[PDB]
């Protein structure tokens, strides 16, 4: 079994059991109950030096189905958590590269599947680096474990379209940059296939740049801090259900994770289809500008 | 009033009222009654050299909602024909560039606003300038005529996404290249594929080299033989947007005649970017899934 990090930074939190040191998580490596997990956008960093033990999970090869657009079903999951030594009861540490952004993205798939100890290593990769702490190469050497077999579930902290057209009148996060947000640009050089045929946001969704939720060290910025971003800067209040979207659901799943595990709204979900979808589907509302607009009648 | 084209080629499709020949409009020319519209994929040819008298629709301005993924209301289609001098009563031909895989597109637009008598020019451009018939470069001052605004009707001709997902087990058309139906491109998306049970037949083997529809037993052999059309099918065509899937609309509504054809506009720029929408891949159709 694997204790809390009982560390004073956390406990202003709603969820401190969500979050890990460097140097708790440095006092653990090699602890029975503990795997360590590197999620990153960029999966060649493992290969350049990983927390020792580390595993990883590949978003290009691992986590989605490869035919549909969806996220793998549970045979899938358990292949892949066994193999990585990791049991229904583990404890999962997951850090990445970017402020923990392709980190919360791995925790939000484990919490699909009802993981229940998955935590973030606050700062990630950037912090761990930063305080000089050491990489190997070396593999984990992992001794396969049996996972069970569960079924997904899409209920509590998943959108899809129809509950987005359906939640006009109800708060909307849109976590892409300004120039996005607007309409100006759709993507990125790097990721083609997640621009689409029309720029612009949801109407009445509020523009909180995911990053913003991150200090310049990477870890997560405190309560005041983030109550700023979201309470005062977004209108967000207590009993709020909140839907967050960006081109893709990996790239909303940071915003997620902040709004349900360190605010402690009740009910957050993610719109995985994201602009992606939003973009090239027909008779959608969409509007340009740097302007939240108005909320239509929910479709 | 404006004679129908009484041409024996024409006669023998279930809608020969759709048609004109080259002979036919060079006869016709500057009658009263009859607009001819240029629509292209390529909108810059209409400067290059265009039918005397014809004027131009636009796809890039002047069919779509600015802000939404869908076409003009009936309000912008009214404009759009009153400033052109076309009356609800007129009738229009159409013709454009490649084989009027596009002028096709045009008329499935003027069909969702009812407007009655739309033809296509048979092998457009590029059968009249092979036979070397005369363009102006010359706009073609037009006095504006009123065009009554009606609701657009969705109903019969068009398709969207839920229509689809409920359509398995009858007959899909998938008029996008080899490589694109196999999944090996992909206007593309993030994943690649068909919808699962749907015929590949790529748009252009409809037409002939000349730029005209093939005869009827050669679309029969295509569409029947082929791809396993029965009579009383309900048929939804797609290609990437709805714009590329018009002409094959057009083939099985008009030509072959199925009462029940419907252009899924959406086609693969939303399917292929939709979430948990079923996807196969290879040469294979592959088997219908339940409907969804």
Do not use: M
Request: proline share 5%; aromatic share 10%; net charge negative.
């Amino acid at each position: 079994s694997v204790d809390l990090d009982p560390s004073a930074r956390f406990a202003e939190y709603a969820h401190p059991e969500r979050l890990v040191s460097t140097e708790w998580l440095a006092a653990h490596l090699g602890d029975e109950g503990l795997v360590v997990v590197e999620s990153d956008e960029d999966v060649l960093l493992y290969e350049t030096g990983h927390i020792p033990g580390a595993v990883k999970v590949d978003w290009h090869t691992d986590l989605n189905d490869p035919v549909q657009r969806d996220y793998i079903d549970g045979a899938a999951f358990a292949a892949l958590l066994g193999e990585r030594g990791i049991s229904r009861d583990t404890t999962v540490v997951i850090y990445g590269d970017k402020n923990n952004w392709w980190a919360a993205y791995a925790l939000w798939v484990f919490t699909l599947f009802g993981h229940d100890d998955v935590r973030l290593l606050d700062g990630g990769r950037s912090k761990w680096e930063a305080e000089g702490r050491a990489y190997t190469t070396d593999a984990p050497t992992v001794a396969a474990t049996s996972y069970p077999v569960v079924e997904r579930d899409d209920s509590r902290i998943r959108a899809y379209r129809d509950d987005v057209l359906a939640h006009f009148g109800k708060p909307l996060i849109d976590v892409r940059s300004p120039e996005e947000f607007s309409g100006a640009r759709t993507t990125a050089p790097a990721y083609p296939e997640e621009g689409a045929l029309r720029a612009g946001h949801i109407p009445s969704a509020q523009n909180v740049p995911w990053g913003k939720a991150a200090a310049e060290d990477g870890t997560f910025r405190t309560l005041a801090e983030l109550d700023a971003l979201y309470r005062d800067g977004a209108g967000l209040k207590d009993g709020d259900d909140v839907v967050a979207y960006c081109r893709i659901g990996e790239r909303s799943s940071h915003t997620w994770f902040v709004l349900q595990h360190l605010l402690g709204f009740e009910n957050v979900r993610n719109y995985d289809g994201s602009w992606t979808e939003w973009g090239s589907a027909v008779r959608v509302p969409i509007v340009q500008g740097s302007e939240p607009g108005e909320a239509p009648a929910p479709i």
